[PDB]
mmCIF file of all heavy atoms in Angstrom:
data_model
loop_
_atom_site.group_PDB
_atom_site.id
_atom_site.type_symbol
_atom_site.label_atom_id
_atom_site.label_comp_id
_atom_site.label_asym_id
_atom_site.label_seq_id
_atom_site.Cartn_x
_atom_site.Cartn_y
_atom_site.Cartn_z
ATOM 1 N N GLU A 526 73.535 124.495 137.687
ATOM 2 C CA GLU A 526 73.446 124.317 136.247
ATOM 3 C C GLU A 526 72.549 123.126 135.949
ATOM 4 O O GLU A 526 72.735 122.045 136.516
ATOM 5 C CB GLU A 526 74.832 124.111 135.633
ATOM 6 C CG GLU A 526 75.093 125.002 134.442
ATOM 7 C CD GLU A 526 75.423 126.417 134.871
ATOM 8 O OE1 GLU A 526 76.544 126.640 135.371
ATOM 9 O OE2 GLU A 526 74.556 127.304 134.725
ATOM 10 N N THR A 527 71.573 123.331 135.067
ATOM 11 C CA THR A 527 70.629 122.292 134.681
ATOM 12 C C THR A 527 70.668 121.952 133.199
ATOM 13 O O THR A 527 70.456 120.789 132.850
ATOM 14 C CB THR A 527 69.196 122.705 135.054
ATOM 15 O OG1 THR A 527 68.875 123.947 134.418
ATOM 16 C CG2 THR A 527 69.065 122.873 136.557
ATOM 17 N N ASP A 528 70.937 122.925 132.329
ATOM 18 C CA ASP A 528 70.973 122.693 130.884
ATOM 19 C C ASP A 528 72.113 121.744 130.543
ATOM 20 O O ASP A 528 73.271 122.053 130.853
ATOM 21 C CB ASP A 528 71.143 124.023 130.145
ATOM 22 C CG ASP A 528 71.001 123.890 128.626
ATOM 23 O OD1 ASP A 528 70.777 122.766 128.131
ATOM 24 O OD2 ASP A 528 71.113 124.917 127.921
ATOM 25 N N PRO A 529 71.844 120.594 129.914
ATOM 26 C CA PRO A 529 72.938 119.675 129.558
ATOM 27 C C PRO A 529 74.032 120.316 128.716
ATOM 28 O O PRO A 529 75.194 119.896 128.799
ATOM 29 C CB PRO A 529 72.215 118.562 128.782
ATOM 30 C CG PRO A 529 70.827 118.600 129.277
ATOM 31 C CD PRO A 529 70.525 120.039 129.565
ATOM 32 N N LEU A 530 73.701 121.329 127.913
ATOM 33 C CA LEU A 530 74.715 121.986 127.097
ATOM 34 C C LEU A 530 75.726 122.733 127.960
ATOM 35 O O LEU A 530 76.938 122.600 127.763
ATOM 36 C CB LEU A 530 74.059 122.935 126.096
ATOM 37 C CG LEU A 530 75.004 123.354 124.972
ATOM 38 C CD1 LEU A 530 75.445 122.141 124.187
ATOM 39 C CD2 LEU A 530 74.335 124.377 124.060
ATOM 40 N N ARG A 531 75.248 123.534 128.916
ATOM 41 C CA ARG A 531 76.175 124.259 129.779
ATOM 42 C C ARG A 531 76.944 123.314 130.692
ATOM 43 O O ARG A 531 78.109 123.577 131.009
ATOM 44 C CB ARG A 531 75.422 125.317 130.589
ATOM 45 C CG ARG A 531 74.930 126.484 129.743
ATOM 46 C CD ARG A 531 75.245 127.819 130.395
ATOM 47 N NE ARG A 531 74.489 128.021 131.628
ATOM 48 C CZ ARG A 531 74.493 129.151 132.331
ATOM 49 N NH1 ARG A 531 75.225 130.182 131.929
ATOM 50 N NH2 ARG A 531 73.770 129.248 133.438
ATOM 51 N N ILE A 532 76.333 122.197 131.090
ATOM 52 C CA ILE A 532 77.048 121.214 131.897
ATOM 53 C C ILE A 532 78.158 120.558 131.081
ATOM 54 O O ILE A 532 79.261 120.322 131.586
ATOM 55 C CB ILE A 532 76.063 120.177 132.474
ATOM 56 C CG1 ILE A 532 75.001 120.873 133.328
ATOM 57 C CG2 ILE A 532 76.797 119.168 133.334
ATOM 58 C CD1 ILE A 532 73.870 119.960 133.791
ATOM 59 N N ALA A 533 77.899 120.273 129.800
ATOM 60 C CA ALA A 533 78.944 119.715 128.945
ATOM 61 C C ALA A 533 80.043 120.737 128.675
ATOM 62 O O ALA A 533 81.226 120.384 128.615
ATOM 63 C CB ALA A 533 78.340 119.214 127.634
ATOM 64 N N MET A 534 79.672 122.010 128.518
ATOM 65 C CA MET A 534 80.669 123.063 128.343
ATOM 66 C C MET A 534 81.558 123.198 129.576
ATOM 67 O O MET A 534 82.773 123.399 129.454
ATOM 68 C CB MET A 534 79.979 124.391 128.019
ATOM 69 C CG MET A 534 79.311 124.423 126.651
ATOM 70 S SD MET A 534 78.042 125.698 126.459
ATOM 71 C CE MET A 534 79.003 127.184 126.736
ATOM 72 N N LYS A 535 80.975 123.086 130.771
ATOM 73 C CA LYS A 535 81.782 123.158 131.986
ATOM 74 C C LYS A 535 82.624 121.896 132.185
ATOM 75 O O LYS A 535 83.741 121.979 132.707
ATOM 76 C CB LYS A 535 80.887 123.414 133.202
ATOM 77 C CG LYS A 535 81.644 123.790 134.467
ATOM 78 C CD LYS A 535 82.476 125.046 134.253
ATOM 79 C CE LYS A 535 81.608 126.259 133.966
ATOM 80 N NZ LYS A 535 80.651 126.534 135.071
ATOM 81 N N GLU A 536 82.108 120.729 131.784
ATOM 82 C CA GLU A 536 82.911 119.507 131.781
ATOM 83 C C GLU A 536 84.097 119.637 130.834
ATOM 84 O O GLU A 536 85.173 119.086 131.091
ATOM 85 C CB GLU A 536 82.039 118.318 131.372
ATOM 86 C CG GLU A 536 81.166 117.737 132.476
ATOM 87 C CD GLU A 536 80.448 116.462 132.042
ATOM 88 O OE1 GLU A 536 80.144 116.322 130.837
ATOM 89 O OE2 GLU A 536 80.181 115.600 132.906
ATOM 90 N N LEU A 537 83.903 120.344 129.720
ATOM 91 C CA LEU A 537 84.974 120.535 128.750
ATOM 92 C C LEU A 537 86.010 121.535 129.252
ATOM 93 O O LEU A 537 87.216 121.327 129.081
ATOM 94 C CB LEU A 537 84.384 121.000 127.419
ATOM 95 C CG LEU A 537 85.401 121.289 126.320
ATOM 96 C CD1 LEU A 537 85.575 120.070 125.432
ATOM 97 C CD2 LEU A 537 84.982 122.511 125.511
ATOM 98 N N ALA A 538 85.556 122.631 129.866
ATOM 99 C CA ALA A 538 86.484 123.639 130.371
ATOM 100 C C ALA A 538 87.424 123.067 131.428
ATOM 101 O O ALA A 538 88.552 123.549 131.581
ATOM 102 C CB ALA A 538 85.704 124.831 130.933
ATOM 103 N N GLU A 539 86.982 122.043 132.160
ATOM 104 C CA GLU A 539 87.808 121.352 133.140
ATOM 105 C C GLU A 539 88.333 120.016 132.624
ATOM 106 O O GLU A 539 88.952 119.268 133.388
ATOM 107 C CB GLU A 539 87.023 121.144 134.435
ATOM 108 C CG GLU A 539 86.517 122.442 135.034
ATOM 109 C CD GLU A 539 85.884 122.246 136.388
ATOM 110 O OE1 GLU A 539 86.395 121.411 137.167
ATOM 111 O OE2 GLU A 539 84.882 122.931 136.679
ATOM 112 N N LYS A 540 88.080 119.698 131.352
ATOM 113 C CA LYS A 540 88.688 118.559 130.658
ATOM 114 C C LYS A 540 88.365 117.235 131.348
ATOM 115 O O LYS A 540 89.244 116.415 131.615
ATOM 116 C CB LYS A 540 90.198 118.751 130.517
ATOM 117 C CG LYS A 540 90.593 120.113 129.993
ATOM 118 C CD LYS A 540 91.565 120.001 128.840
ATOM 119 C CE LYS A 540 90.857 119.501 127.600
ATOM 120 N NZ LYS A 540 91.826 119.193 126.518
ATOM 121 N N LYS A 541 87.080 117.024 131.623
ATOM 122 C CA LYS A 541 86.608 115.793 132.243
ATOM 123 C C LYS A 541 85.694 114.996 131.314
ATOM 124 O O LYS A 541 84.841 114.241 131.787
ATOM 125 C CB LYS A 541 85.889 116.104 133.558
ATOM 126 C CG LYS A 541 86.809 116.621 134.651
ATOM 127 C CD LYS A 541 87.879 115.604 134.996
ATOM 128 C CE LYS A 541 88.836 116.151 136.040
ATOM 129 N NZ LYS A 541 89.964 115.217 136.309
ATOM 130 N N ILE A 542 85.847 115.158 130.003
ATOM 131 C CA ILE A 542 85.022 114.452 129.027
ATOM 132 C C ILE A 542 85.806 113.270 128.469
ATOM 133 O O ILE A 542 86.643 113.451 127.573
ATOM 134 C CB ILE A 542 84.566 115.397 127.904
ATOM 135 C CG1 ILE A 542 83.859 116.622 128.493
ATOM 136 C CG2 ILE A 542 83.669 114.666 126.930
ATOM 137 C CD1 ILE A 542 83.259 117.555 127.458
ATOM 138 N N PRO A 543 85.562 112.042 128.952
ATOM 139 C CA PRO A 543 86.387 110.882 128.563
ATOM 140 C C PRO A 543 86.015 110.321 127.193
ATOM 141 O O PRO A 543 85.697 109.136 127.034
ATOM 142 C CB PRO A 543 86.104 109.892 129.701
ATOM 143 C CG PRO A 543 84.689 110.165 130.049
ATOM 144 C CD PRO A 543 84.508 111.664 129.909
ATOM 145 N N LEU A 544 86.059 111.182 126.183
ATOM 146 C CA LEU A 544 85.845 110.785 124.801
ATOM 147 C C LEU A 544 87.140 110.941 124.011
ATOM 148 O O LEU A 544 88.048 111.684 124.395
ATOM 149 C CB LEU A 544 84.728 111.609 124.151
ATOM 150 C CG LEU A 544 83.303 111.369 124.658
ATOM 151 C CD1 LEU A 544 82.382 112.515 124.252
ATOM 152 C CD2 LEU A 544 82.761 110.024 124.182
ATOM 153 N N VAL A 545 87.220 110.208 122.903
ATOM 154 C CA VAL A 545 88.345 110.287 121.980
ATOM 155 C C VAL A 545 87.805 110.654 120.603
ATOM 156 O O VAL A 545 86.709 110.228 120.220
ATOM 157 C CB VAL A 545 89.157 108.969 121.940
ATOM 158 C CG1 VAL A 545 88.488 107.919 121.062
ATOM 159 C CG2 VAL A 545 90.576 109.225 121.471
ATOM 160 N N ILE A 546 88.552 111.486 119.883
ATOM 161 C CA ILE A 546 88.220 111.879 118.519
ATOM 162 C C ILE A 546 89.143 111.114 117.586
ATOM 163 O O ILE A 546 90.371 111.199 117.708
ATOM 164 C CB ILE A 546 88.359 113.398 118.318
ATOM 165 C CG1 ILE A 546 87.191 114.139 118.974
ATOM 166 C CG2 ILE A 546 88.438 113.743 116.835
ATOM 167 C CD1 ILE A 546 87.436 114.543 120.412
ATOM 168 N N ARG A 547 88.562 110.352 116.662
ATOM 169 C CA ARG A 547 89.337 109.567 115.705
ATOM 170 C C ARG A 547 89.346 110.335 114.386
ATOM 171 O O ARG A 547 88.454 110.182 113.551
ATOM 172 C CB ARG A 547 88.753 108.165 115.554
ATOM 173 C CG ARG A 547 89.445 107.314 114.502
ATOM 174 C CD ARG A 547 89.175 105.837 114.718
ATOM 175 N NE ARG A 547 89.833 105.349 115.925
ATOM 176 C CZ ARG A 547 89.935 104.066 116.252
ATOM 177 N NH1 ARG A 547 89.430 103.134 115.455
ATOM 178 N NH2 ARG A 547 90.548 103.711 117.375
ATOM 179 N N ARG A 548 90.361 111.182 114.212
ATOM 180 C CA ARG A 548 90.494 111.949 112.981
ATOM 181 C C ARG A 548 90.960 111.042 111.857
ATOM 182 O O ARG A 548 91.952 110.323 111.999
ATOM 183 C CB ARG A 548 91.483 113.093 113.176
ATOM 184 C CG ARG A 548 91.125 113.979 114.336
ATOM 185 C CD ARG A 548 92.282 114.845 114.745
ATOM 186 N NE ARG A 548 91.828 116.124 115.272
ATOM 187 C CZ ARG A 548 92.650 117.077 115.692
ATOM 188 N NH1 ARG A 548 93.961 116.881 115.652
ATOM 189 N NH2 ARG A 548 92.164 118.222 116.159
ATOM 190 N N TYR A 549 90.259 111.088 110.731
ATOM 191 C CA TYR A 549 90.487 110.156 109.636
ATOM 192 C C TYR A 549 91.281 110.833 108.529
ATOM 193 O O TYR A 549 90.953 111.949 108.109
ATOM 194 C CB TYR A 549 89.160 109.623 109.090
ATOM 195 C CG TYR A 549 88.791 108.267 109.647
ATOM 196 C CD1 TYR A 549 87.804 108.134 110.613
ATOM 197 C CD2 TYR A 549 89.446 107.120 109.221
ATOM 198 C CE1 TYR A 549 87.468 106.893 111.130
ATOM 199 C CE2 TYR A 549 89.117 105.874 109.732
ATOM 200 C CZ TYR A 549 88.128 105.767 110.687
ATOM 201 O OH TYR A 549 87.793 104.533 111.204
ATOM 202 N N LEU A 550 92.328 110.156 108.065
ATOM 203 C CA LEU A 550 93.109 110.566 106.911
ATOM 204 C C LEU A 550 92.524 109.953 105.639
ATOM 205 O O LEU A 550 91.914 108.880 105.686
ATOM 206 C CB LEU A 550 94.568 110.146 107.080
ATOM 207 C CG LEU A 550 95.335 110.944 108.140
ATOM 208 C CD1 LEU A 550 96.734 110.380 108.366
ATOM 209 C CD2 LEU A 550 95.390 112.418 107.763
ATOM 210 N N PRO A 551 92.686 110.617 104.490
ATOM 211 C CA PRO A 551 91.979 110.167 103.275
ATOM 212 C C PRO A 551 92.399 108.795 102.769
ATOM 213 O O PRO A 551 91.620 108.171 102.037
ATOM 214 C CB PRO A 551 92.310 111.262 102.253
ATOM 215 C CG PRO A 551 92.662 112.456 103.085
ATOM 216 C CD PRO A 551 93.376 111.899 104.275
ATOM 217 N N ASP A 552 93.591 108.306 103.118
ATOM 218 C CA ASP A 552 93.998 106.973 102.680
ATOM 219 C C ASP A 552 93.286 105.863 103.443
ATOM 220 O O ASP A 552 93.208 104.735 102.943
ATOM 221 C CB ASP A 552 95.517 106.800 102.808
ATOM 222 C CG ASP A 552 95.997 106.808 104.255
ATOM 223 O OD1 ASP A 552 95.470 107.602 105.060
ATOM 224 O OD2 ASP A 552 96.906 106.016 104.587
ATOM 225 N N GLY A 553 92.766 106.152 104.632
ATOM 226 C CA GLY A 553 92.138 105.141 105.459
ATOM 227 C C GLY A 553 92.708 105.103 106.862
ATOM 228 O O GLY A 553 92.089 104.559 107.782
ATOM 229 N N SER A 554 93.896 105.680 107.030
ATOM 230 C CA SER A 554 94.531 105.749 108.336
ATOM 231 C C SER A 554 93.833 106.789 109.209
ATOM 232 O O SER A 554 93.064 107.630 108.732
ATOM 233 C CB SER A 554 96.022 106.080 108.198
ATOM 234 O OG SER A 554 96.237 107.316 107.533
ATOM 235 N N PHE A 555 94.109 106.721 110.508
ATOM 236 C CA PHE A 555 93.462 107.616 111.454
ATOM 237 C C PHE A 555 94.433 107.955 112.576
ATOM 238 O O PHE A 555 95.509 107.367 112.701
ATOM 239 C CB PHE A 555 92.173 107.000 112.013
ATOM 240 C CG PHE A 555 92.315 105.564 112.452
ATOM 241 C CD1 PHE A 555 93.028 105.235 113.593
ATOM 242 C CD2 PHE A 555 91.742 104.543 111.713
ATOM 243 C CE1 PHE A 555 93.155 103.917 113.992
ATOM 244 C CE2 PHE A 555 91.870 103.220 112.109
ATOM 245 C CZ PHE A 555 92.576 102.910 113.248
ATOM 246 N N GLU A 556 94.028 108.927 113.388
ATOM 247 C CA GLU A 556 94.768 109.359 114.564
ATOM 248 C C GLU A 556 93.779 109.586 115.696
ATOM 249 O O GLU A 556 92.816 110.343 115.537
ATOM 250 C CB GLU A 556 95.563 110.641 114.288
ATOM 251 C CG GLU A 556 96.705 110.473 113.294
ATOM 252 C CD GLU A 556 97.585 111.705 113.211
ATOM 253 O OE1 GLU A 556 97.225 112.734 113.816
ATOM 254 O OE2 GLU A 556 98.635 111.648 112.536
ATOM 255 N N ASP A 557 94.010 108.924 116.827
ATOM 256 C CA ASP A 557 93.140 109.049 117.987
ATOM 257 C C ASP A 557 93.668 110.131 118.916
ATOM 258 O O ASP A 557 94.841 110.107 119.303
ATOM 259 C CB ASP A 557 93.037 107.718 118.730
ATOM 260 C CG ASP A 557 92.405 106.630 117.886
ATOM 261 O OD1 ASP A 557 91.893 106.942 116.790
ATOM 262 O OD2 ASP A 557 92.423 105.459 118.317
ATOM 263 N N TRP A 558 92.797 111.070 119.278
ATOM 264 C CA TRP A 558 93.152 112.192 120.138
ATOM 265 C C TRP A 558 92.181 112.238 121.308
ATOM 266 O O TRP A 558 90.977 112.421 121.107
ATOM 267 C CB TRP A 558 93.111 113.516 119.363
ATOM 268 C CG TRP A 558 94.329 113.746 118.534
ATOM 269 C CD1 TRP A 558 94.756 112.992 117.482
ATOM 270 C CD2 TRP A 558 95.306 114.779 118.710
ATOM 271 N NE1 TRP A 558 95.929 113.500 116.982
ATOM 272 C CE2 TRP A 558 96.289 114.596 117.720
ATOM 273 C CE3 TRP A 558 95.442 115.844 119.605
ATOM 274 C CZ2 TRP A 558 97.392 115.438 117.598
ATOM 275 C CZ3 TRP A 558 96.538 116.677 119.483
ATOM 276 C CH2 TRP A 558 97.497 116.471 118.487
ATOM 277 N N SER A 559 92.693 112.061 122.522
ATOM 278 C CA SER A 559 91.852 112.261 123.690
ATOM 279 C C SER A 559 91.464 113.734 123.797
ATOM 280 O O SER A 559 92.196 114.622 123.354
ATOM 281 C CB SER A 559 92.573 111.795 124.959
ATOM 282 O OG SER A 559 93.145 112.878 125.669
#
């Protein structure tokens, strides 16, 4: 695999992407989800 998109998709399918999503609530609060 050479295309960075397919490599990221395969990293995601095996859950090796060490990023966090900070979902924001309208009041200003947030929730962090690995």
